């Protein structure tokens, strides 16, 4: 083992700077522990595999609304990062994608000190996506919950997927499924009323 101790240190260094909870480190340690003992992956890119597990760890509880805010290390061997990511992503699922029916209220999703401004914006984003049927991998309901997250992101609101997965009781992985092929090249989910609070333009990865 060589990249094992190296990756762990790299992850801990980044997680500590971003002020991430143990939910990240503990998870990443458990994930890397298995991905490092892979036949195909003999530790090709330490930085890549480290970031891969890191992304999976903050997937639900840890992501600051966008992965861009923590893309400090995700600027090297990004190809291998996504490569190893898919391997572990299909290894353990929360299995929350079994409801997706009570999001029709939507109001309770903003109970976490979320202004109705995000609510109105989310419905507009969802409408454009649903009416276009950009993501037929689930249902029109899943797009609504996912739109709430997208609306929060574009409103500089750092929310996590945990809220929608557990508190909302919709489906955590459903957000990722909706936020998959919903964008052709850019977040063209804005009708007209969306003035776009965060003018970053290039907003890839949540």
């Amino acid at each position: 083992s060589r990249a094992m101790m190296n990756a762990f240190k790299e992850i801990t260094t980044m997680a500590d700077r971003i002020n991430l909870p143990r939910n990240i480190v503990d998870r990443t340690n458990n994930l890397f522990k298995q991905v490092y003992e892979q036949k195909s992956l003999k530790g090709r890119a330490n930085d890549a595999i480290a970031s891969a597990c890191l992304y999976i760890a903050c997937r639900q509880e840890g992501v600051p609304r966008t992965f861009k805010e923590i893309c400090a290390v995700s600027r090297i061997s990004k190809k291998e990062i996504g490569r190893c990511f898919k391997l572990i992503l299909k290894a353990l699922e929360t299995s929350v994608d079994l409801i997706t029916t009570g999001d029709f209220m939507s109001r309770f999703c903003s109970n976490l000190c979320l202004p109705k401004q995000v609510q109105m914006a989310a419905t507009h984003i969802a409408r454009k996506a649903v009416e276009l049927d950009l993501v037929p991998g689930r249902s029109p309901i899943s797009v609504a919950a996912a739109a709430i997250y997208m609306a929060s992101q574009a409103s500089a609101e750092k929310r996590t997927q945990k809220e929608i997965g557990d508190i909302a009781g919709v489906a955590d992985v459903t957000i990722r499924q909706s936020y998959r092929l919903i964008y052709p090249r850019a977040p063209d989910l804005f009708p007209t009323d969306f003035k776009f609070d965060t003018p970053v333009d290039k907003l890839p990865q949540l």
Binding site: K78, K86, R185, K202, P204
Partner: peptide, 26 residues
Amino acid sequence: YGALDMADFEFEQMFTDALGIDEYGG
């Protein structure tokens, strides 16, 4: 077939920023 799925997220890690700067290459 499941193990065949690896590069599917590669485009969501590398291509995301690579193509994201394509339309903003100025």
